[PDB]
């Protein structure tokens, strides 16, 4: 398997572009940024709203926990490669505490509204608009040779009043190299694509398109997360009871993957459930034909058939968003 688009970006760019391990951090001043209040965390980070002491602008201070320095230089190299990209979080500075050498990443600040509270308030148009803005970021990172590998609502900051969106958290992101087998231990369980769940390691930018489809399904069907499994095996069973197991067996067969036998037993045999079955009167005003047609082309087992980010932006579902952008 190979990406259908932007497959040679790394292949043909100079080695320093993707050789993040040869990166040399020009450390900033740790005292320029002061913590104001905690806004998030993760297994390997503690995230704070900060303040730039020199100019009084808000910032994000992402203090890393001890991790191999390959993981810290990748993410910094990726952020440097994408800086300036549409809707791509801006990396402003990188600092260390002298005594422990604990690195902090400094980013712009987004006045975000938690997605579990913001999403349910979104009009039909807002959903169209925010996914379109998120699509810009994804087409731009893919075109620069990078897979995000962690598309999900926690990683999409939205200032609703400013209608600004930024794709944040490049901590799992990677350089796409044709043929490379990657670890499938990426993305959050609910947003993990079938390829990660059935061990197809030579995945590409289309893993982000499945994750985007998962976010979109959740927003139009008002069901977060849309595919709610308790562990990977179960994450695949949840997918199989929606998409059907016939599609799954075509996919497995095409790529020549045999399921772990018990996983196989667990998956069973399920009929494809049409998309309108999730329609209910709360989500009614969001689940039109174009929405289903768009969603249906993102949630395909075959990562090769999913729309590219560039194609999705031109889908008729986003026509009104595009016309507004033209003014
Ligand atoms: N208000 C606000 N909150 C933010 C901002 N940036 C990050 N956060 C909060 O901090 C959280 C975690 O930071 P993130 O960069 O995603 O996390 P990570 O530490 O690498 N974690 P993970 O890999 O699990 O997603 C975000 O999910 C978000 O809720 C921001 O710019 N503004
Ligand atoms: Mg995150
Ligand atoms: Mg992360």
mmCIF file of C-alpha atoms and ligand atoms in Angstrom:
data_model
loop_
_atom_site.group_PDB
_atom_site.id
_atom_site.type_symbol
_atom_site.label_atom_id
_atom_site.label_comp_id
_atom_site.label_asym_id
_atom_site.label_seq_id
_atom_site.Cartn_x
_atom_site.Cartn_y
_atom_site.Cartn_z
ATOM 1 C CA UNK A 1 0.000 0.000 0.000
ATOM 2 C CA UNK A 2 1.112 3.524 -0.907
ATOM 3 C CA UNK A 3 -0.603 6.881 -0.510
ATOM 4 C CA UNK A 4 -2.545 7.920 -3.656
ATOM 5 C CA UNK A 5 -1.442 11.583 -3.161
ATOM 6 C CA UNK A 6 1.707 13.313 -1.867
ATOM 7 C CA UNK A 7 3.621 10.058 -1.777
ATOM 8 C CA UNK A 8 6.979 11.510 -2.848
ATOM 9 C CA UNK A 9 7.258 14.752 -0.813
ATOM 10 C CA UNK A 10 9.858 13.281 1.589
ATOM 11 C CA UNK A 11 11.436 11.070 -1.072
ATOM 12 C CA UNK A 12 12.348 14.160 -3.128
ATOM 13 C CA UNK A 13 12.945 16.888 -0.536
ATOM 14 C CA UNK A 14 16.414 17.293 0.971
ATOM 15 C CA UNK A 15 17.173 14.896 3.839
ATOM 16 C CA UNK A 16 17.233 17.674 6.485
ATOM 17 C CA UNK A 17 13.519 18.250 5.838
ATOM 18 C CA UNK A 18 12.532 14.864 7.290
ATOM 19 C CA UNK A 19 15.631 13.854 9.244
ATOM 20 C CA UNK A 20 14.244 15.143 12.535
ATOM 21 C CA UNK A 21 16.862 13.247 14.620
ATOM 22 C CA UNK A 22 19.542 15.638 13.166
ATOM 23 C CA UNK A 23 17.540 18.576 14.621
ATOM 24 C CA UNK A 24 19.354 21.105 16.835
ATOM 25 C CA UNK A 25 17.078 22.968 19.261
ATOM 26 C CA UNK A 26 17.812 26.697 19.649
ATOM 27 C CA UNK A 27 16.466 26.974 23.172
ATOM 28 C CA UNK A 28 14.540 30.111 24.144
ATOM 29 C CA UNK A 29 14.296 31.832 27.545
ATOM 30 C CA UNK A 30 12.210 29.860 30.073
ATOM 31 C CA UNK A 31 11.423 33.096 32.001
ATOM 32 C CA UNK A 32 9.607 34.751 29.068
ATOM 33 C CA UNK A 33 6.575 32.538 29.628
ATOM 34 C CA UNK A 34 4.636 32.280 32.849
ATOM 35 C CA UNK A 35 1.971 29.725 33.658
ATOM 36 C CA UNK A 36 -1.499 31.258 34.339
ATOM 37 C CA UNK A 37 -3.854 28.151 34.523
ATOM 38 C CA UNK A 38 -3.886 24.451 33.577
ATOM 39 C CA UNK A 39 -5.946 23.643 30.475
ATOM 40 C CA UNK A 40 -5.026 20.053 29.738
ATOM 41 C CA UNK A 41 -2.824 17.082 30.134
ATOM 42 C CA UNK A 42 -1.994 13.790 28.517
ATOM 43 C CA UNK A 43 0.203 10.875 29.458
ATOM 44 C CA UNK A 44 3.396 12.750 28.505
ATOM 45 C CA UNK A 45 2.497 16.414 28.855
ATOM 46 C CA UNK A 46 0.972 19.034 31.158
ATOM 47 C CA UNK A 47 -0.660 21.930 29.301
ATOM 48 C CA UNK A 48 -1.167 25.420 30.621
ATOM 49 C CA UNK A 49 -2.565 28.731 29.473
ATOM 50 C CA UNK A 50 0.489 31.010 29.796
ATOM 51 C CA UNK A 51 1.386 34.645 29.319
ATOM 52 C CA UNK A 52 4.316 35.999 27.325
ATOM 53 C CA UNK A 53 5.884 38.350 29.895
ATOM 54 C CA UNK A 54 7.535 40.610 27.303
ATOM 55 C CA UNK A 55 4.399 41.444 25.285
ATOM 56 C CA UNK A 56 1.447 40.348 27.464
ATOM 57 C CA UNK A 57 -0.076 37.989 24.870
ATOM 58 C CA UNK A 58 -1.632 34.694 25.930
ATOM 59 C CA UNK A 59 0.244 31.536 25.025
ATOM 60 C CA UNK A 60 0.163 27.800 25.544
ATOM 61 C CA UNK A 61 2.881 26.178 27.559
ATOM 62 C CA UNK A 62 3.200 22.446 26.941
ATOM 63 C CA UNK A 63 5.505 20.898 29.516
ATOM 64 C CA UNK A 64 6.712 17.481 28.431
ATOM 65 C CA UNK A 65 7.288 14.491 30.694
ATOM 66 C CA UNK A 66 10.443 12.400 30.272
ATOM 67 C CA UNK A 67 10.326 10.694 26.891
ATOM 68 C CA UNK A 68 12.991 9.607 24.398
ATOM 69 C CA UNK A 69 14.372 12.735 22.739
ATOM 70 C CA UNK A 70 13.484 11.227 19.320
ATOM 71 C CA UNK A 71 9.793 11.884 20.258
ATOM 72 C CA UNK A 72 10.591 15.523 21.260
ATOM 73 C CA UNK A 73 12.659 16.336 18.172
ATOM 74 C CA UNK A 74 10.062 14.851 15.724
ATOM 75 C CA UNK A 75 7.195 17.000 16.931
ATOM 76 C CA UNK A 76 9.371 20.140 16.928
ATOM 77 C CA UNK A 77 10.680 19.316 13.448
ATOM 78 C CA UNK A 78 7.091 18.776 12.301
ATOM 79 C CA UNK A 79 5.848 22.017 13.822
ATOM 80 C CA UNK A 80 8.713 23.933 12.127
ATOM 81 C CA UNK A 81 7.888 22.335 8.744
ATOM 82 C CA UNK A 82 4.208 23.302 9.036
ATOM 83 C CA UNK A 83 4.445 26.766 10.699
ATOM 84 C CA UNK A 84 2.432 29.264 8.631
ATOM 85 C CA UNK A 85 0.182 26.498 7.239
ATOM 86 C CA UNK A 86 -3.549 27.199 7.232
ATOM 87 C CA UNK A 87 -5.114 26.419 10.613
ATOM 88 C CA UNK A 88 -1.867 24.779 11.863
ATOM 89 C CA UNK A 89 -1.151 25.591 15.531
ATOM 90 C CA UNK A 90 1.807 27.981 15.694
ATOM 91 C CA UNK A 91 4.933 26.839 17.611
ATOM 92 C CA UNK A 92 6.362 30.032 19.095
ATOM 93 C CA UNK A 93 9.312 29.030 21.262
ATOM 94 C CA UNK A 94 10.856 25.955 22.899
ATOM 95 C CA UNK A 95 12.274 26.231 26.458
ATOM 96 C CA UNK A 96 13.986 24.109 29.102
ATOM 97 C CA UNK A 97 14.218 24.371 32.864
ATOM 98 C CA UNK A 98 17.971 24.543 33.656
ATOM 99 C CA UNK A 99 18.047 22.244 36.678
ATOM 100 C CA UNK A 100 16.109 19.341 35.087
ATOM 101 C CA UNK A 101 16.187 20.113 31.345
ATOM 102 C CA UNK A 102 12.412 19.592 31.222
ATOM 103 C CA UNK A 103 11.360 20.897 27.805
ATOM 104 C CA UNK A 104 8.314 23.066 27.273
ATOM 105 C CA UNK A 105 6.737 23.798 23.876
ATOM 106 C CA UNK A 106 5.241 27.270 23.551
ATOM 107 C CA UNK A 107 2.315 27.800 21.207
ATOM 108 C CA UNK A 108 -0.185 30.491 20.280
ATOM 109 C CA UNK A 109 -3.239 30.416 22.515
ATOM 110 C CA UNK A 110 -6.719 29.495 21.389
ATOM 111 C CA UNK A 111 -9.719 30.476 23.494
ATOM 112 C CA UNK A 112 -11.288 27.042 23.038
ATOM 113 C CA UNK A 113 -14.775 25.846 24.002
ATOM 114 C CA UNK A 114 -14.615 22.162 25.142
ATOM 115 C CA UNK A 115 -16.001 20.018 22.293
ATOM 116 C CA UNK A 116 -18.400 18.080 24.514
ATOM 117 C CA UNK A 117 -20.095 21.445 25.211
ATOM 118 C CA UNK A 118 -19.341 23.290 21.927
ATOM 119 C CA UNK A 119 -20.343 20.572 19.376
ATOM 120 C CA UNK A 120 -23.984 20.241 20.502
ATOM 121 C CA UNK A 121 -24.503 23.978 20.038
ATOM 122 C CA UNK A 122 -23.073 23.996 16.450
ATOM 123 C CA UNK A 123 -25.526 24.867 13.709
ATOM 124 C CA UNK A 124 -25.493 22.724 10.557
ATOM 125 C CA UNK A 125 -23.452 25.428 8.842
ATOM 126 C CA UNK A 126 -20.837 25.690 11.674
ATOM 127 C CA UNK A 127 -20.129 21.932 11.331
ATOM 128 C CA UNK A 128 -19.668 22.454 7.602
ATOM 129 C CA UNK A 129 -17.434 25.402 8.350
ATOM 130 C CA UNK A 130 -15.256 23.839 11.064
ATOM 131 C CA UNK A 131 -14.723 20.548 9.209
ATOM 132 C CA UNK A 132 -13.751 22.577 6.118
ATOM 133 C CA UNK A 133 -11.243 24.571 8.160
ATOM 134 C CA UNK A 134 -9.909 21.346 9.694
ATOM 135 C CA UNK A 135 -9.662 19.892 6.131
ATOM 136 C CA UNK A 136 -7.377 22.817 5.160
ATOM 137 C CA UNK A 137 -4.960 21.861 7.905
ATOM 138 C CA UNK A 138 -5.033 18.209 6.906
ATOM 139 C CA UNK A 139 -4.562 18.840 3.198
ATOM 140 C CA UNK A 140 -1.699 21.171 4.107
ATOM 141 C CA UNK A 141 0.078 18.709 6.435
ATOM 142 C CA UNK A 142 -0.340 15.793 3.995
ATOM 143 C CA UNK A 143 1.062 17.939 1.139
ATOM 144 C CA UNK A 144 4.097 18.630 3.323
ATOM 145 C CA UNK A 145 4.678 14.926 3.829
ATOM 146 C CA UNK A 146 3.209 14.505 7.299
ATOM 147 C CA UNK A 147 0.495 12.377 8.808
ATOM 148 C CA UNK A 148 -1.084 13.829 11.976
ATOM 149 C CA UNK A 149 -2.045 10.420 13.407
ATOM 150 C CA UNK A 150 -4.184 11.845 16.168
ATOM 151 C CA UNK A 151 -7.146 13.535 14.636
ATOM 152 C CA UNK A 152 -9.831 13.896 17.271
ATOM 153 C CA UNK A 153 -11.862 16.640 18.939
ATOM 154 C CA UNK A 154 -9.409 17.202 21.881
ATOM 155 C CA UNK A 155 -6.775 18.052 19.273
ATOM 156 C CA UNK A 156 -8.910 20.630 17.406
ATOM 157 C CA UNK A 157 -9.060 23.973 19.314
ATOM 158 C CA UNK A 158 -11.894 26.303 18.356
ATOM 159 C CA UNK A 159 -12.414 29.942 19.248
ATOM 160 C CA UNK A 160 -16.100 30.005 18.309
ATOM 161 C CA UNK A 161 -16.482 33.774 18.635
ATOM 162 C CA UNK A 162 -13.518 34.305 16.246
ATOM 163 C CA UNK A 163 -14.481 31.214 14.165
ATOM 164 C CA UNK A 164 -10.823 30.267 14.278
ATOM 165 C CA UNK A 165 -9.641 26.651 14.316
ATOM 166 C CA UNK A 166 -6.169 25.194 14.829
ATOM 167 C CA UNK A 167 -5.095 21.560 14.463
ATOM 168 C CA UNK A 168 -2.944 21.105 17.556
ATOM 169 C CA UNK A 169 -0.995 18.196 19.077
ATOM 170 C CA UNK A 170 1.608 17.028 16.607
ATOM 171 C CA UNK A 171 3.022 14.645 19.234
ATOM 172 C CA UNK A 172 2.082 11.484 17.242
ATOM 173 C CA UNK A 173 2.646 13.078 13.816
ATOM 174 C CA UNK A 174 5.039 11.487 11.344
ATOM 175 C CA UNK A 175 6.863 11.844 8.074
ATOM 176 C CA UNK A 176 5.284 9.787 5.322
ATOM 177 C CA UNK A 177 7.684 7.524 3.493
ATOM 178 C CA UNK A 178 6.353 5.195 0.784
ATOM 179 C CA UNK A 179 6.549 1.561 1.961
ATOM 180 C CA UNK A 180 7.339 2.276 5.642
ATOM 181 C CA UNK A 181 5.551 0.117 8.162
ATOM 182 C CA UNK A 182 4.509 2.318 11.086
ATOM 183 C CA UNK A 183 3.436 1.490 14.560
ATOM 184 C CA UNK A 184 -0.331 1.091 14.617
ATOM 185 C CA UNK A 185 -0.341 2.268 18.243
ATOM 186 C CA UNK A 186 -1.417 5.778 17.277
ATOM 187 C CA UNK A 187 -4.519 7.927 17.478
ATOM 188 C CA UNK A 188 -7.179 7.634 20.161
ATOM 189 C CA UNK A 189 -9.097 4.354 20.182
ATOM 190 C CA UNK A 190 -12.363 5.901 18.902
ATOM 191 C CA UNK A 191 -10.623 7.492 15.926
ATOM 192 C CA UNK A 192 -8.370 4.545 15.069
ATOM 193 C CA UNK A 193 -8.834 3.338 11.504
ATOM 194 C CA UNK A 194 -9.457 -0.245 10.482
ATOM 195 C CA UNK A 195 -5.857 -0.462 9.222
ATOM 196 C CA UNK A 196 -4.556 0.169 12.741
ATOM 197 C CA UNK A 197 -6.998 -2.393 14.184
ATOM 198 C CA UNK A 198 -6.165 -5.260 11.796
ATOM 199 C CA UNK A 199 -2.417 -4.561 11.801
ATOM 200 C CA UNK A 200 -1.818 -3.039 8.349
ATOM 201 C CA UNK A 201 1.326 -1.042 9.146
ATOM 202 C CA UNK A 202 1.999 0.560 5.775
ATOM 203 C CA UNK A 203 -0.687 3.193 6.230
ATOM 204 C CA UNK A 204 -0.606 6.779 4.965
ATOM 205 C CA UNK A 205 -2.349 10.142 5.134
ATOM 206 C CA UNK A 206 -5.735 8.458 4.687
ATOM 207 C CA UNK A 207 -5.543 7.286 8.295
ATOM 208 C CA UNK A 208 -6.387 10.970 9.149
ATOM 209 C CA UNK A 209 -9.380 10.889 6.813
ATOM 210 C CA UNK A 210 -10.899 7.956 8.759
ATOM 211 C CA UNK A 211 -10.337 9.878 11.991
ATOM 212 C CA UNK A 212 -11.941 12.993 10.471
ATOM 213 C CA UNK A 213 -14.905 10.832 9.372
ATOM 214 C CA UNK A 214 -15.261 9.604 12.946
ATOM 215 C CA UNK A 215 -15.408 13.204 14.206
ATOM 216 C CA UNK A 216 -17.890 14.135 11.500
ATOM 217 C CA UNK A 217 -20.163 11.165 12.213
ATOM 218 C CA UNK A 218 -20.200 12.124 15.891
ATOM 219 C CA UNK A 219 -21.080 15.729 15.107
ATOM 220 C CA UNK A 220 -23.901 15.052 12.586
ATOM 221 C CA UNK A 221 -25.327 12.082 14.499
ATOM 222 C CA UNK A 222 -24.761 13.732 17.907
ATOM 223 C CA UNK A 223 -23.056 10.616 19.238
ATOM 224 C CA UNK A 224 -19.636 10.965 20.809
ATOM 225 C CA UNK A 225 -17.594 9.127 20.134
ATOM 226 C CA UNK A 226 -19.526 7.599 17.247
ATOM 227 C CA UNK A 227 -17.625 4.249 17.433
ATOM 228 C CA UNK A 228 -17.337 3.465 21.138
ATOM 229 C CA UNK A 229 -15.323 0.317 21.808
ATOM 230 C CA UNK A 230 -13.641 -0.415 25.127
ATOM 231 C CA UNK A 231 -10.394 -1.754 23.617
ATOM 232 C CA UNK A 232 -8.991 -2.278 20.085
ATOM 233 C CA UNK A 233 -10.628 -5.624 19.290
ATOM 234 C CA UNK A 234 -13.958 -4.142 20.414
ATOM 235 C CA UNK A 235 -13.206 -0.935 18.436
ATOM 236 C CA UNK A 236 -13.100 -3.167 15.345
ATOM 237 C CA UNK A 237 -16.384 -4.953 16.345
ATOM 238 C CA UNK A 238 -18.105 -1.564 16.656
ATOM 239 C CA UNK A 239 -16.889 -0.634 13.151
ATOM 240 C CA UNK A 240 -17.989 -4.014 11.725
ATOM 241 C CA UNK A 241 -21.587 -3.715 13.085
ATOM 242 C CA UNK A 242 -22.015 -0.424 11.239
ATOM 243 C CA UNK A 243 -20.091 -0.991 7.996
ATOM 244 C CA UNK A 244 -20.967 -4.696 7.725
ATOM 245 C CA UNK A 245 -18.484 -7.587 7.641
ATOM 246 C CA UNK A 246 -18.810 -8.212 3.891
ATOM 247 C CA UNK A 247 -16.895 -4.935 3.209
ATOM 248 C CA UNK A 248 -14.380 -5.985 5.865
ATOM 249 C CA UNK A 249 -13.727 -9.371 4.243
ATOM 250 C CA UNK A 250 -13.187 -7.681 0.834
ATOM 251 C CA UNK A 251 -10.644 -5.342 2.516
ATOM 252 C CA UNK A 252 -8.770 -7.985 4.481
ATOM 253 C CA UNK A 253 -8.658 -10.125 1.349
ATOM 254 C CA UNK A 254 -7.399 -7.238 -0.814
ATOM 255 C CA UNK A 255 -4.457 -6.459 1.469
ATOM 256 C CA UNK A 256 -3.891 -10.093 2.479
ATOM 257 C CA UNK A 257 -4.438 -9.849 6.203
ATOM 258 C CA UNK A 258 -5.867 -12.683 8.246
ATOM 259 C CA UNK A 259 -7.581 -11.527 11.451
ATOM 260 C CA UNK A 260 -6.275 -12.749 14.785
ATOM 261 C CA UNK A 261 -8.533 -15.803 15.144
ATOM 262 C CA UNK A 262 -10.377 -14.700 18.337
ATOM 263 C CA UNK A 263 -10.820 -11.159 17.008
ATOM 264 C CA UNK A 264 -12.275 -12.897 13.965
ATOM 265 C CA UNK A 265 -14.704 -14.854 16.175
ATOM 266 C CA UNK A 266 -15.607 -11.656 18.029
ATOM 267 C CA UNK A 267 -16.295 -9.672 14.873
ATOM 268 C CA UNK A 268 -18.816 -12.258 13.704
ATOM 269 C CA UNK A 269 -20.963 -11.531 10.664
ATOM 270 C CA UNK A 270 -23.099 -8.363 10.566
ATOM 271 C CA UNK A 271 -25.239 -6.729 7.902
ATOM 272 C CA UNK A 272 -24.264 -3.283 6.731
ATOM 273 C CA UNK A 273 -26.330 -0.742 8.586
ATOM 274 C CA UNK A 274 -27.378 2.085 6.273
ATOM 275 C CA UNK A 275 -26.381 5.575 7.567
ATOM 276 C CA UNK A 276 -29.916 6.943 7.991
ATOM 277 C CA UNK A 277 -30.569 4.365 10.744
ATOM 278 C CA UNK A 278 -28.684 6.672 13.187
ATOM 279 C CA UNK A 279 -30.897 9.560 12.245
ATOM 280 C CA UNK A 280 -33.163 10.440 15.164
ATOM 281 C CA UNK A 281 -35.109 13.671 15.839
ATOM 282 C CA UNK A 282 -32.180 15.379 17.713
ATOM 283 C CA UNK A 283 -29.777 15.018 14.792
ATOM 284 C CA UNK A 284 -32.404 15.315 12.024
ATOM 285 C CA UNK A 285 -31.514 18.883 11.072
ATOM 286 C CA UNK A 286 -27.897 17.854 10.423
ATOM 287 C CA UNK A 287 -28.098 14.520 8.581
ATOM 288 C CA UNK A 288 -28.943 15.420 4.971
ATOM 289 C CA UNK A 289 -28.023 13.555 1.767
ATOM 290 C CA UNK A 290 -24.789 15.499 1.165
ATOM 291 C CA UNK A 291 -23.669 14.922 4.769
ATOM 292 C CA UNK A 292 -24.294 11.184 4.441
ATOM 293 C CA UNK A 293 -22.648 11.112 0.973
ATOM 294 C CA UNK A 294 -19.601 12.904 2.360
ATOM 295 C CA UNK A 295 -19.440 10.709 5.499
ATOM 296 C CA UNK A 296 -19.878 7.557 3.432
ATOM 297 C CA UNK A 297 -16.743 8.454 1.398
ATOM 298 C CA UNK A 298 -14.691 9.048 4.569
ATOM 299 C CA UNK A 299 -15.696 5.856 6.496
ATOM 300 C CA UNK A 300 -14.504 3.094 4.204
ATOM 301 C CA UNK A 301 -12.369 0.206 5.499
ATOM 302 C CA UNK A 302 -10.198 0.526 2.456
ATOM 303 C CA UNK A 303 -7.985 3.516 3.222
ATOM 304 C CA UNK A 304 -7.253 3.685 -0.513
ATOM 305 C CA UNK A 305 -10.905 4.550 -1.356
ATOM 306 C CA UNK A 306 -11.362 7.276 1.240
ATOM 307 C CA UNK A 307 -11.374 10.798 -0.079
ATOM 308 C CA UNK A 308 -8.159 12.765 0.179
ATOM 309 C CA UNK A 309 -8.329 15.994 2.168
ATOM 310 C CA UNK A 310 -8.069 17.976 -1.102
ATOM 311 C CA UNK A 311 -11.032 16.035 -2.577
ATOM 312 C CA UNK A 312 -13.197 16.399 0.538
ATOM 313 C CA UNK A 313 -12.957 20.191 0.475
ATOM 314 C CA UNK A 314 -14.503 20.212 -2.991
ATOM 315 C CA UNK A 315 -17.419 17.940 -2.057
ATOM 316 C CA UNK A 316 -20.812 19.631 -2.629
ATOM 317 C CA UNK A 317 -21.497 19.293 1.118
ATOM 318 C CA UNK A 318 -19.182 22.351 1.652
ATOM 319 C CA UNK A 319 -20.418 24.435 -1.302
ATOM 320 C CA UNK A 320 -21.922 27.254 0.809
ATOM 321 C CA UNK A 321 -18.710 27.457 2.903
ATOM 322 C CA UNK A 322 -16.618 27.796 -0.224
ATOM 323 C CA UNK A 323 -19.014 30.494 -1.621
ATOM 324 C CA UNK A 324 -18.701 32.455 1.627
ATOM 325 C CA UNK A 325 -14.901 32.262 1.350
ATOM 326 C CA UNK A 326 -15.077 33.763 -2.113
ATOM 327 C CA UNK A 327 -17.050 36.548 -0.366
HETATM 328 N N1 LIG B 1 -7.915 26.693 25.856
HETATM 329 C C1 LIG B 1 -7.022 25.873 25.368
HETATM 330 N N2 LIG B 1 -6.888 24.645 25.785
HETATM 331 C C2 LIG B 1 -5.880 24.061 25.102
HETATM 332 C C3 LIG B 1 -5.084 24.592 24.116
HETATM 333 N N3 LIG B 1 -4.165 23.781 23.642
HETATM 334 C C4 LIG B 1 -4.397 22.716 24.306
HETATM 335 N N4 LIG B 1 -5.374 22.788 25.235
HETATM 336 C C5 LIG B 1 -5.846 21.691 26.060
HETATM 337 O O1 LIG B 1 -4.803 20.832 26.317
HETATM 338 C C6 LIG B 1 -5.186 19.529 25.839
HETATM 339 C C7 LIG B 1 -3.978 18.661 25.679
HETATM 340 O O2 LIG B 1 -2.861 19.099 24.924
HETATM 341 P P1 LIG B 1 -2.383 18.333 23.637
HETATM 342 O O3 LIG B 1 -1.565 19.343 22.893
HETATM 343 O O4 LIG B 1 -3.504 17.870 22.795
HETATM 344 O O5 LIG B 1 -2.022 17.014 24.371
HETATM 345 P P2 LIG B 1 -0.962 15.902 24.456
HETATM 346 O O6 LIG B 1 -0.418 16.250 25.766
HETATM 347 O O7 LIG B 1 0.232 15.787 23.555
HETATM 348 N N5 LIG B 1 -2.105 14.832 24.675
HETATM 349 P P3 LIG B 1 -2.871 13.821 23.788
HETATM 350 O O8 LIG B 1 -1.806 13.090 22.988
HETATM 351 O O9 LIG B 1 -3.397 12.739 24.709
HETATM 352 O O10 LIG B 1 -3.922 14.262 22.897
HETATM 353 C C8 LIG B 1 -6.030 19.766 24.599
HETATM 354 O O11 LIG B 1 -6.796 18.577 24.284
HETATM 355 C C9 LIG B 1 -6.850 20.962 25.118
HETATM 356 O O12 LIG B 1 -8.062 20.550 25.754
HETATM 357 C C10 LIG B 1 -5.317 25.892 23.750
HETATM 358 O O13 LIG B 1 -4.600 26.476 22.806
HETATM 359 N N6 LIG B 1 -6.300 26.537 24.391
HETATM 360 MG MG1 LIG B 2 -3.830 16.058 22.500
HETATM 361 MG MG1 LIG B 3 -0.616 14.437 21.904
#
